[PDB]
């Protein structure tokens, strides 16, 4: 229901994550500005990263079954999990309560996240 369902191979997720990781410096002025905005909608994942001065967004097509949603996840954490998996890993990220559940075969992570609506206002 309120579970942003997402599923992708890591090859199509490594490069866009690095692309949207540009503005994410050492210390962000706002706390949530140290994160990435993830949106699954219209069969597409949008990755957004902002520095309150510049924003970079990467879109990836989605073929696996999914459920639309949006959530703000820690930048360097999510990148570290995504990069640390073995080559060809099929990452399945879900939203349970206030936690991103990252599952890949026998590997399970439960990252803490910020509400999507609290990410500035990109409108």
């Amino acid at each position: 229901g309120p579970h942003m369902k997402f599923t992708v191979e890591r090859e199509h997720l490594l490069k866009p994550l690095q692309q949207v990781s540009g503005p994410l410096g050492g210390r962000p002025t706002l706390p949530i500005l140290g994160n990435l905005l993830l949106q699954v909608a219209d069969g597409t994942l949008s990755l957004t990263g902002t520095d309150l001065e510049m924003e970079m967004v990467a879109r990836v097509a989605l073929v696996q079954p999914h459920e639309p949603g949006a959530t703000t996840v820690p930048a360097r954490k999510f990148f570290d999990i995504c990069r640390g998996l073995p080559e060809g890993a099929e990452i399945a990220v879900q939203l349970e309560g206030e936690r991103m559940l990252v599952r890949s075969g026998r590997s399970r992570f439960s990252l803490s996240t910020l509400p999507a609506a609290d990410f500035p206002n990109l409108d």
């Binding site: 002025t29 609290d118 500035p120």
Partner: protein, 360 residues
């Protein structure tokens, strides 16, 4: 069943809801309405005086669809986004967090970029006096020629540490610590609107204990309500203020002068229950006696540090001959000299007060 904290729930939203600081409000309104707003406004007051509230209200006046004015509107987009703390370009910075010249330079690289919303990009720096000298110089350099839609708001509790050159760049306002009347009236209004049963004497005790700060008054009101189950009577506030009392040295001096042995014993037992170090108590008693002697020499010897208990100090200076002051000072000096080798100092301080009372 919210029962939120009364401090922030009752933060002013319109300039007409700010208690005191009337001249500052008039000056801000005049600048917002007819004149051209100065490129930088600095605020200096006491703890819990209204500084950040006034700065936030001024920023609300700056960015609003009704235009740059004093009382813009209610429940607008920009006003609400500021009141909820979610406004984007209302940058809120703690100076102590960014004393480094590198962090300050990074902060001052943001002024060039245009505001995301509203008209003016407002920076609100708290406790600005704690900025490093290099960071302060960089702030002055960016303040001399700011962009046409970039404005700075600075606040500090003690403006004496700010270099004089800050006056060359920004218009400063000083907020006077609220008196007992204004604090009492505002607390009465808050309690009346919140439907809290209360007595005027309880409000007077809260206001006097606040020592000029309205935030202190609100915190004490919250504690009084919590302990008194909403029924804020005089006895409850008096007891819970006595639990927080720390004027023991002054009361000890007053009672020892009055040759009131039982009062001195009760007060010293209360100080023991407070767990106060006895050497510190005796040295601050010596300091109080020395201050009484000096203010006897000249009325100007007093300052604003003792502006909380200055009435009793003036009465003590008026009523006590200097010879008694000298005798008491000598007695307390020898008591402090003999304190370490005495028994448990709780009774050594007692017996020093005994020797002082012997001069009757």
């Amino acid at each position: 069943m919210s029962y939120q904290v009364l401090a922030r729930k009752w933060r002013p939203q319109t300039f007409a809801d700010v208690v005191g600081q009337e001249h500052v409000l008039t000056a801000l309104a005049n600048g917002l309405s007819l004149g051209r707003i100065h490129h930088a406004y600095l605020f200096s007051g006491t703890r819990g005086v209204g500084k950040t509230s006034i700065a936030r209200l001024l920023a609300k006046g700056l960015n609003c669809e009704t235009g740059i004015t004093a009382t813009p509107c209610g429940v607008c987009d920009n006003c609400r986004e500021i009141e909820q703390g979610r406004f984007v370009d209302l940058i809120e910075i703690d100076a102590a967090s960014r004393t480094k010249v590198e962090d300050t330079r990074d902060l001052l690289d943001n002024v060039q970029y245009a505001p995301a919303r509203g008209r003016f990009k407002v920076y609100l720096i708290d406790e600005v006096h704690m900025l490093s000298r290099h960071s302060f110089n960089a702030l002055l350099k960016t303040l001399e020629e700011p962009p046409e839609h970039v404005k700075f708001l600075l606040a500090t509790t003690d403006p004496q540490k700010l270099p004089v050159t800050i006056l060359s760049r920004c218009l400063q306002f000083h907020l006077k610590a609220l008196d007992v009347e204004q604090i009492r009236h505002q607390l009465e209004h808050i309690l009346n609107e919140e439907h809290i049963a209360h007595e005027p004497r309880a409000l007077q005790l809260l206001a006097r204990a606040a020592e000029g700060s309205l935030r202190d008054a609100l915190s004490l009101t919250d504690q009084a309500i919590a302990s008194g189950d909403g029924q804020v009577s005089t006895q409850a506030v008096s007891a819970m203020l006595g639990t927080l009392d720390d004027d023991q040295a002054l009361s000890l001096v007053e009672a020892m002068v009055e040759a009131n042995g039982e009062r001195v014993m009760a007060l010293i037992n209360e100080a023991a229950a407070r767990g106060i170090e006895w050497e510190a108590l005796l040295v601050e008693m010596l300091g109080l006696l020395h201050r009484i002697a000096m203010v006897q020499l000249s009325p100007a010897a007093l300052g604003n540090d003792m502006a909380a208990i200055e009435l009793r100090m003036r009465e003590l200076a008026r009523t006590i001959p200097p010879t008694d002051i000298q005798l008491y000072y000598q007695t307390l000096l020898i008591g402090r000299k003999e304190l370490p080798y005495a028994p448990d100092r709780r009774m050594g301080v007692e017996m020093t007060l005994l020797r002082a009372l012997a001069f009757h």
